[PDB]
Amino acid sequence: LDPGLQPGQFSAEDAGAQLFAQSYQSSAEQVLFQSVAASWAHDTNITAENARRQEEAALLSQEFAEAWGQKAKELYEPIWQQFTDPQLRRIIGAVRTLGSANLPLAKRQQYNALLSQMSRIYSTAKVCLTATCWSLDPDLTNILASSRSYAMLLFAWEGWHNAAGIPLKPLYEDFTALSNEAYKQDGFTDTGAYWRSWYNSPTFEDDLEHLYQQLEPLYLNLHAFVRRALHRRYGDRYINLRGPIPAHLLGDMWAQSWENIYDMVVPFPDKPNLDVTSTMLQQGWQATHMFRVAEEFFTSLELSPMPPEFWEGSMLEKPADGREVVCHASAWDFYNRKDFRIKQCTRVTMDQLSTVHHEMGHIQYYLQYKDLPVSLRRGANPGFHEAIGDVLALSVSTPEHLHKIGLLDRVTNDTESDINYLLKMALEKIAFLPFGYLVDQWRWGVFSGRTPPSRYNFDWWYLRTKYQGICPPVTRNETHFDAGAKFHVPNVTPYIRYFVSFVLQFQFHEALCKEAGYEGPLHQCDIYRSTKAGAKLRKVLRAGSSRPWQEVLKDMVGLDALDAQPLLKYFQLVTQWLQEQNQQNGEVLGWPEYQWHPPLPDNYPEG
Numbered sequence: 001l002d003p004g005l006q007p008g009q010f011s012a013e014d015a016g017a018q019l020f021a022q023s024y025q026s027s028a029e030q031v032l033f034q035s036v037a038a039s040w041a042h043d044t045n046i047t048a049e050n051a052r053r054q055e056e057a058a059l060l061s062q063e064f065a066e067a068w069g070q071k072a073k074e075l076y077e078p079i080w081q082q083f084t085d086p087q088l089r090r091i092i093g094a095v096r097t098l099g100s101a102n103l104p105l106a107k108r109q110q111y112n113a114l115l116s117q118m119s120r121i122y123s124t125a126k127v128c129l130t131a132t133c134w135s136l137d138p139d140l141t142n143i144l145a146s147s148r149s150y151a152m153l154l155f156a157w158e159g160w161h162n163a164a165g166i167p168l169k170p171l172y173e174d175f176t177a178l179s180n181e182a183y184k185q186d187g188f189t190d191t192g193a194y195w196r197s198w199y200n201s202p203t204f205e206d207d208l209e210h211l212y213q214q215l216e217p218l219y220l221n222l223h224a225f226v227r228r229a230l231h232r233r234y235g236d237r238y239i240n241l242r243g244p245i246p247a248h249l250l251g252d253m254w255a256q257s258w259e260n261i262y263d264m265v266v267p268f269p270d271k272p273n274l275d276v277t278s279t280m281l282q283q284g285w286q287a288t289h290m291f292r293v294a295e296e297f298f299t300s301l302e303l304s305p306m307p308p309e310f311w312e313g314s315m316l317e318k319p320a321d322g323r324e325v326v327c328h329a330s331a332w333d334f335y336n337r338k339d340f341r342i343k344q345c346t347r348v349t350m351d352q353l354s355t356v357h358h359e360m361g362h363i364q365y366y367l368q369y370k371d372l373p374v375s376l377r378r379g380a381n382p383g384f385h386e387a388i389g390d391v392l393a394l395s396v397s398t399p400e401h402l403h404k405i406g407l408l409d410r411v412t413n414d415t416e417s418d419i420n421y422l423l424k425m426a427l428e429k430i431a432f433l434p435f436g437y438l439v440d441q442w443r444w445g446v447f448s449g450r451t452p453p454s455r456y457n458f459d460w461w462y463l464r465t466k467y468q469g470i471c472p473p474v475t476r477n478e479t480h481f482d483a484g485a486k487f488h489v490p491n492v493t494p495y496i497r498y499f500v501s502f503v504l505q506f507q508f509h510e511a512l513c514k515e516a517g518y519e520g521p522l523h524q525c526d527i528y529r530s531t532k533a534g535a536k537l538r539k540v541l542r543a544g545s546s547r548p549w550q551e552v553l554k555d556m557v558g559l560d561a562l563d564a565q566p567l568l569k570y571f572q573l574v575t576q577w578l579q580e581q582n583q584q585n586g587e588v589l590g591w592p593e594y595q596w597h598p599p600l601p602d603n604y605p606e607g
């Protein structure tokens, strides 16, 4: 480690800690910067040489983290939590958790290579037929969204899960062991315990479970209604009205968001078409327009535009020069207070317009907290960070807002139109809840050792069936590693943040709508051009992780905890309607034929 980046001496106390943090701050931006830059260079241009560079950057960050980490424990370990500066306790607390820097050098290098190899396998996996092969984004994504051929959907789903998952398994095993080894030396029972610790809530798992109990009935009713809609198309051979839904028929590779099957489930087809995808295509929207339209929503609230550096640096379309890139949409803080970028393989659809807003929310958080100490440039918790963009997208998706921006010609305010909208939103927001909840239940079990490698897939499918009421459309065994075919697993990104976000965003939406002086039904609120709403959101964004999330939440919404009531209020009309409709249709809620799997198509896969 360069002498300029090494820690000096400091008194064994608060006053020494404060100069220690400022000295860290000075060195850390360079170290954070070089790490992020090397990761950017790799993820926008996946090559062996860019991986080597990213690994060397990662070693340097570990060197840095070890030096500054061990210094913190030399001086403070027996006394550190009693500092009177709460921001400084947070800075120190982060600094003294070494993580992968606890590993001896040989194991660090092993750990870094595993992350690099897992990333490459996920983002370069292909399904081949012929010499021609399909990538996840856009080819397989488009098949899952637009094919209504059972066999074609099956080919794409099976191909992807087999291509990505199978080779990932042995690496994921080794990564899990090393990660646990690392975090155990910080005093955590396992890596999952460290990940949950970010919410600073001793009742976190019980609180999540209590939220899910309130939300599950909404999901079961949506599920049953959608299952009926699918049965009407695919027939009795491939849909069991008392069984789990085949996991490939819901519009999405992970069955995590169901908005692509909206045309099959829309209650009142004769009302205005609320999926504006076909209008975006007819009007010739491109990625550029989508990012500018999203930006202009943020500036309408008197939040910040995207700086020149964002526009010059960002990757907003998949490269047409054939390069391998990480297509999974992401938002980048380079930790130099100037460079902020999005990397998205943007496609021209309504849900991608929502995703643009999501990623731009991350960026806005970065812009607003850029002058805080680098350890406090985080969301109040990770769920806050995931919620910001989704909150704006809630306003954007309203038929009134879509009309304002030229995407929906007809205006209507009737009960049928409200049901259509709320159903469309339920396919996006309610359908996700079980998946948002289950992914880290799986991963927490892997980290704790409750789920060894011998049960990776068995336990994944247990949770997929238990929560989502889906089944794999072909047989799986423990050679398959279906968890690994979801980005966040091989890319080691925690998932419970998204469950938290999906509840939180309705709390935020309710609070901002009220601050805006809106007095109508919550699901028709649009905060566009509300400078008052913008000011309230800005307070949250400027806090970063400087204060406990419970206090930030309380200032924003009047409550110091996650609460499902705003979400339930938003959806109330369609919750009631789906319940009535399922009862009238004689549906079974749930999937009591839990063992059921669909048969193979007659000629699969030669067709």
Ligand SMILES: *[C@@H]1O[C@H](CO[C@@H]2O[C@@H](C)[C@@H](O)[C@@H](O)[C@@H]2O)[C@@H](O[C@@H]2O[C@H](CO)[C@@H](O[C@@H]3O[C@H](CO)[C@@H](O)[C@H](O)[C@@H]3O)[C@H](O)[C@H]2NC(C)=O)[C@H](O)[C@H]1NC(C)=O
Residues within 6 Å of the ligand: 400, 413, 519, 520, 521, 524
């Ligand atoms: C779509 O239509 C709804 C329903 O409007 C109501 O019912 C219709 C059939 C007609 O009879 C309307 O005349 C009637 O308002 C609109 O929702 C309603 O919005 C109004 C105006 O913001 C709300 O009234 C306010 O209520 C608060 C107290 O909650 C008062 O302090 C205010 O002074 C004001 O009177 C009304 O509560 C609300 N009703 C419901 C059931 O939510 C909605 O605004 C409209 N949407 C659009 C986009 O036009």
Ligand SMILES: *[C@@H]1O[C@H](CO)[C@@H](O[C@@H]2O[C@H](CO)[C@@H](O)[C@H](O)[C@H]2NC(C)=O)[C@H](O)[C@H]1NC(C)=O
Residues within 6 Å of the ligand: 045, 047, 048, 049, 050
């Ligand atoms: C993709 O990454 C490779 C490196 O792995 C880049 O190729 C290098 O380009 C730089 C100029 O920026 C030269 O100094 C090197 O001689 C090149 N190395 C090799 C091995 O060819 C390439 O420029 C990157 N592509 C893009 C579009 O940025």
Ligand SMILES: *[C@@H]1O[C@H](CO[C@@H]2O[C@@H](C)[C@@H](O)[C@@H](O)[C@@H]2O)[C@@H](O)[C@H](O)[C@H]1NC(C)=O
Residues within 6 Å of the ligand: 475, 476, 477, 478, 479, 480
């Ligand atoms: C796991 O499954 C692998 C391939 O899938 C199988 O092939 C299709 C045609 C059906 O037979 C389906 O039921 C199977 O899933 C096998 O190559 C492999 O032997 C199995 N793995 C182990 C460890 O036994």
Ligand SMILES: [Cl-]
Residues within 6 Å of the ligand: 195, 198, 382, 383, 494, 495, 496, 497
């Ligand atoms: Cl998280």
Ligand SMILES: [Zn+2]
Residues within 6 Å of the ligand: 358, 359, 362, 385, 386
């Ligand atoms: Zn995100």
